[PDB]
Paper text:
Human NAD-dependent isocitrate dehydrogenase or IDH3 (HsIDH3) catalyzes the decarboxylation of isocitrate into α-ketoglutarate in the tricarboxylic acid cycle. It consists of three types of subunits (α, β, and γ) and exists and functions as the (αβαγ)2 heterooctamer. HsIDH3 is regulated allosterically and/or competitively by numerous metabolites including CIT, ADP, ATP, and NADH. In this work, we report the crystal structures of the αβ and αγ heterodimers and the (αβαγ)2 heterooctamer containing an α-Q139A mutation in the clasp domain, which renders all the heterodimers and the heterooctamer constitutively active in the absence of activators.
Author numbering:
A (entry chain F): 15 to 349
B (entry chain H): 4 to 348, 350 to 351
C (entry chain E): 3 to 338
D (entry chain G): 4 to 45, 51 to 74, 81 to 338
Write the structure that this text describes.
């Protein structure tokens, strides 16, 4: 019933506005508790999580955009975006990469998924100076959380009925680093025999994604490899925004845009495409046990994109965001 | 695993014993002879330990220790380090045994006169998390990073041991040793690790102290200390210093405990390779190791009659060993303690 | 008039197409000497950590060398071949360009990208450290000099190849100190190189836009790990590692030009291989040395054979052989 | 005539700093003093304190109360050496009677980078940083202090058998200066060996160098043999000839304004300061004068402690320093 919306930065709020109207145009009974924002321009929540967690402790579901990160302007011991993720234990990150009937990229009829770790790995902001101009950073990767994302990778394959996962790695140079990770995968993969499984080098995997990505179905990787391949698959489809995203911490469920943001446009002019959040918010309503609204919203968005009439600068056309949002609610009205 | 229960067949507890290198064997035989005269129901399982074949055989030698939960050992010469890969013969055993706590007992000896008198101190420290870090990689040439590690878990396990030690023994003060004023997080973690357990034994007064002033405080008024505890890095300092206060390495019993396993070792880790079969080595530490080894088998009656003896023989000036400033030989001491050792309770 | 190049034909199809390259060079009147060397990792005074010296003093004088594909390690303990080549020759800059092929049906057209990859300080350095049970930590370090070093080279390449812009790829927003000091020196180099446009895009943002439209880029720069994956990434657009050339630049004028594709022993010696990948690394050698007049001729006839489509290797789908492929390019560099 | 930047400090700090300027006036010490305060501001120091030492190159420092100020002056001039000469004191009865050793304590690198890292929720990692640089420099400075003080033997305390890379490199450059300065005797000895030998017979020792962690603990230890920080001189040296000669004892606020202090350490920090600038004759008339006043056993103060006031202990030295 009650949900909290954290617009973040970018056109995220402009996108949240598109959902709010699309919700009021689809009789969606969710009283949003969006409250201000987390970091970015606002600065440290701080402990936004305290502000943030208390809402999540009650709502147990939310949806945000992208923090988009600060590039170490502030004291910034560690990236703030991970910490909220840590305070909420959002160890898993799910990216639905599903080619869409309307958009005709250089690759069609694809339906993969990116499973991603968000707590262990180099995204810890850990560093220091050894000498004059000699800096040292630490990639953290531990067995406890490596299992949980390895565990996460496989139960996903069963409930959705997927075929095979493939653990990504560069352990051939970090024998201890991705080797520990890769073992926790092959340790768990033994426990899922009705699931084919592979391991692939990262650079070799990325090059296969540009030659033949149809070969592999589910992928699991640590934090750095996630943010890398995330924006890769989203970019191949067309834009980071169109592909949605999901991140589950504890019993809580969080949805957001797939990629961080369409960086090149960097626009607050409402030109940005809201398909991404909408598809994620639809997949949210599918989680909220309200499959009807999730199903009907996804149906309208898909067919509308399949119409080829209304499109934005990313999708080959030129439409305002609220023009598209209106034609969304237009095919939502007659249905 | 396939591990059985260590059992005591009809009287004699069966204890694992390791001779070692250098002074090790020539002392153990007296410890045997001391026991055998004292009619101590402890049988001894000899196991040749190391510097003869430290490759895979010693390992069949681990097993005897994993069997009987209690062993007494001498020392093993350090590996040449040609392998230069860990491989501390002594250390490996305490790793594959999960021997976390290391305990020494510096006590004053009425027959051994030192600069200070009336001293009784129990020292506690870890082994695999009390800093003493290895690793040490070279980022670029001329630059080396060392990585001292504190684990909150092993810090409380060694902490609880410090206090489980005090209550069963009737002590009164546990004093933490640290450098939290420089490494606020590492040693402060250990500090707050101590504070947590310190509230679970409120009868026992608790105090902290910086490693610096603590060393100063020893050479001036060491009697204030009752129980001290630190991570394994600062130990080498406190140990060897508290060792020299009441005498020398040949007077301090030692012990490495595990969660179940218990090993008895000398206070000072000296090979004595230079005093090989000289009938010279100070036995009083090695003997004291057997004392607390009997105290751990809950046979105090014999450890007490042994302990009162070795203090007894030591007080005559003639029995002291060269390493502490005497003119006698071990054979006289062992027998003089045996003289001192009366037939309590035999014929 | 003539020049010396230390040739390492290698394993598998390598020597077969290594001689195919040495023929097209004589077919285009190329003044180049071939000093055939093997470089298999010999054992040193204690382990496995040194090379055939006979190949070493050659490079220490020839300065330029061509390396083909090489096989795996005899035992787990043996180290990576290209690692000692890095440490024994200080190959800091790792070069891999990618240009669309007019006669290749890849669903990506009109790209012309070059990657500048840092090669020693970095995640690739073997330093890692176990902390406690089940707690592993890798070591990534970045230094002022080698960052300043890989920088001053990449700008010279664009200055030396008529390139226009330069983009700095990083994620200094997240690993702030490391990539930041990399970036703060990247900025400090464009301060004296105002003749070349310069910008910075986040690494995750580069990948996304690199996927949708690739031509919107020129040459790219990054530290080691990002390189070894983005280079293989960008390789797929240009037809993958097998058809894409590469380069490694060491100190004291020492350069290295290689293909990255495998050695292919399941098709070795059957006259099927596609030598064009390393053949272009030879062209990169001609470009770094100065025979553009001879480099532009071969790169043209190289493109012309692929453009006509009359002869193609089986990896390109065709039915021609390596000799059939080598001869049509030889008979083409003659018609110039 | 030479100028010295002085600082009063907290507690008995000013009450004893003037007891020194009054005895240096009585010793005919060619010193015109220069009084600056240094209380932490903004972080950095007063600029009028920053300038005062950049010209004078020397300074006498006293007790400071509670980042740390000792860390600031460290990096302000790159204090790369903490020196502490501990010497027996006839009269002052301590169970250690034949002592004469100077602890050299490198003050730059080591685990004192404060650089700690939480790794997981309960795992903390502190960094120990060791460079070839700060070692070779504290190696040359040790040999220059030995030569310029008639010192016989120089030992390099270490545990290089343990930290085979860390303490090994420290020792590696320890030897390299010894052949290029065979002038003074040089030997090595493991820390735990020194720690035992220190409490058995300190006399066998002479001069000791070590990295920072061992230095801070060994420094307060070697002092503990003679009586405490109240009788312990202390000298820090930095780049470009700068030098600081502090005391180390606590501010002792319970009797700050009482004239119940013992400054002798701060004096021997100045007698040390005198001996650093070649004032052997004037430091030889001051040092032995204070030795005799304690050796007489009449004008001692309360932490020693007889029954007098800090001025009486100060007045008898002025009576015994006016003679040669």
């Amino acid at each position: 019933f009650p949900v909290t919306m954290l617009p973040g930065d970018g056109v995220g709020p402009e996108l949240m506005h598109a959902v709010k109207e699309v919700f009021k145009a689809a009789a969606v009974p969710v009283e949003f508790q969006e409250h201000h924002l987390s970091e970015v321009q606002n600065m440290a929540s701080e402990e936004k999580l305290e502000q943030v967690l208390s809402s999540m402790k009650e709502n147990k579901v939310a949806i945000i955009g992208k923090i988009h990160t600060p590039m170490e302007y502030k004291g910034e011991l560690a990236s703030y975006d991970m910490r909220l993720r840590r305070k909420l234990d959002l160890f898993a990150n799910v990216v639905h990469v599903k080619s869409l009937p309307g958009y005709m990229t250089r690759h069609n009829n694809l339906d993969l998924v990116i499973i991603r770790e968000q707590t262990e790995g180099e995204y810890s902001s850990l560093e220091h100076e050894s000498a004059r101009g000699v800096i040292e950073c630490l990639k953290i990767v531990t067995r406890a959380k490596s299992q949980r994302i390895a565990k996460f990778a496989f139960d996903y394959a069963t409930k959705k009925g997927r075929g095979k996962v493939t653990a990504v790695h560069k352990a051939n140079i970090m024998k201890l680093g991705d080797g520990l990770f890769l073992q926790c995968c092959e340790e768990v993969a033994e426990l899922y025999p009705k699931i084919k499984f592979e391991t692939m080098i990262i650079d070799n995997c990325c090059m296969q994604l540009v030659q033949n990505p149809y070969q592999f179905d589910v992928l699991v990787m640590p934090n750095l490899y996630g943010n890398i391949i995330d924006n890769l698959a989203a970019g191949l489809v067309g834009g980071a925004g169109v592909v949605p995203g999901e991140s589950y911490s504890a019993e809580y469920a969080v949805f957001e845009t797939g990629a961080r943001h369409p960086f090149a446009q960097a626009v607050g002019r409402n030109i940005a495409n809201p398909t991404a959040m909408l598809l994620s918010a639809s997949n949210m309503l599918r989680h909220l046990n309200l499959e009807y609204h999730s199903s009907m919203i996804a149906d309208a968005v898909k067919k509308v994109i399949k119409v080829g009439k209304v499109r934005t600068s990313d999708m080959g056309g030129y439409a305002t965001c609220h023009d598209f949002t209106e034609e969304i609610c237009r095919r939502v009205k007659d249905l | 695993q396939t591990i059985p229960p260590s059992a005591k067949y009809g009287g004699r507890h069966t204890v694992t014993m390791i001779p070692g290198d250098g002074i090790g064997p020539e002392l153990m035989l007296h410890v045997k002879s001391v026991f055998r005269h004292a009619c101590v129901p402890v049988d001894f399982e000899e196991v040749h330990v190391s510097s003869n074949a430290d490759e895979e055989d010693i390992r069949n030698a681990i097993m005897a220790i994993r069997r009987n939960r209690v062993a007494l050992k001498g020392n093993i010469e350090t590996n040449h380090n040609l392998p230069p890969s860990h491989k501390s013969r002594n250390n490996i055993l305490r790793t594959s045994l999960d021997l976390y706590a290391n305990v020494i007992h510096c006590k004053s000896l009425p027959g051994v006169v030192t600069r200070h008198k009336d001293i009784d101190i129990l020292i506690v420290r870890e082994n695999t998390e009390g800093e003493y870090s290895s690793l040490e990689h070279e980022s670029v040439a001329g630059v080396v990073e060392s990585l001292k590690i504190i684990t909150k878990a092993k810090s409380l396990r060694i902490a609880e041991y410090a206090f489980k030690l005090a209550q069963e023994s009737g002590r009164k003060k546990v004093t933490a040793v640290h450098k939290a004023n420089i490494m606020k997080l590492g040693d402060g973690l250990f500090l707050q690790c101590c504070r947590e357990v310190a509230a679970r034994y409120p009868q026992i007064t608790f105090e902290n102290m910086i490693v610096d002033n603590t060393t100063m405080q020893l050479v001036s008024r060491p009697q204030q200390f009752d129980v001290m505890v630190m991570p394994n890095l600062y130990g080498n300092i406190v140990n060897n210093v508290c060792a020299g206060l009441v005498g020398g390495p040949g007077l301090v019993a030692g012990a490495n405990y595990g969660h179940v396993y218990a090993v008895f070792e000398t206070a000072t880790r000296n090979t004595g390779k230079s005093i090989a079969n000289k009938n010279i080595a100070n036995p009083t530490a090695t003997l004291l190791a057997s004392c607390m080894m009997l105290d751990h088998l809950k046979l105090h009656s014999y450890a007490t009659s042994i302990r009162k003896a070795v203090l007894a023989s030591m007080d005559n000036e003639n029995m002291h060993t060269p390493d502490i400033g005497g003119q006698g030989t071990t054979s006289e001491a062992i027998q003089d303690v045996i003289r001192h050792i009366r037939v309590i309770n035999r014929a | 008039g003539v020049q010396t190049v230390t040739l390492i034909p290698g394993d598998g199809i390598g020597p077969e197409i290594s001689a195919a390259v040495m023929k097209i060079f004589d077919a285009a009147k190329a003044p180049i000497q071939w000093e055939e060397r093997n470089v298999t990792a010999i054992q040193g005074p204690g382990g496995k950590w040194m090379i055939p010296s006979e190949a070493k003093e050659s490079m220490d004088k020839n300065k330029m060398g061509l390396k083909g594909p090489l096989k795996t390690p005899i035992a787990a303990g043996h180290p990576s071949m290209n690692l000692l080549l890095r440490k024994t020759f200080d190959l800091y800059a790792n070069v891999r360009p990618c240009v669309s092929i007019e006669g290749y049906k890849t669903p990506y057209t009109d790209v012309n990208i070059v990657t500048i990859r840092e090669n020693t300080e970095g995640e690739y350095s073997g330093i890692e450290h176990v902390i406690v049970d089940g707690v592993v930590a890798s070591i990534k370090l970045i230094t002022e000099g080698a960052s300043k070093r890989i920088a001053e080279f990449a700008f010279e390449y664009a200055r030396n190849n008529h390139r226009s812009n330069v983009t700095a790829v990083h994620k200094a927003n997240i690993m702030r100190m490391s990539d930041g000091l990399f970036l703060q020196k990247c900025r400090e180099v464009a301060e004296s190189c105002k003749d070349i446009k310069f910008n910075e895009m986040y690494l995750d943002t580069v990948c996304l836009n690199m996927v949708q439209d690739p031509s919107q880029f020129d040459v790219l720069v990054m530290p080691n790990l990002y390189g070894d994956i983005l280079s293989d990434l960008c390789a797929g657009l240009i037809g993958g590692l097998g058809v894409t050339p590469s380069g490694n630049i060491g100190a004291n004028g020492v350069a290295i030009f290689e293909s990255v594709h495998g050695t292919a022993p399941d098709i070795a010696g059957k006259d099927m291989a596609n030598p064009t990948a390393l053949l272009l690394s030879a062209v990169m050698m001609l470009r770094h040395m100065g025979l553009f007049d001879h480099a532009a001729r071969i790169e043209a006839a190289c493109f012309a054979t692929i453009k006509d489509g009359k002869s193609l290797t089986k990896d390109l789908g065709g039915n021609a052989k390596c000799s059939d492929f080598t001869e049509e390019i030889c008979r083409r560099v003659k018609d110039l």
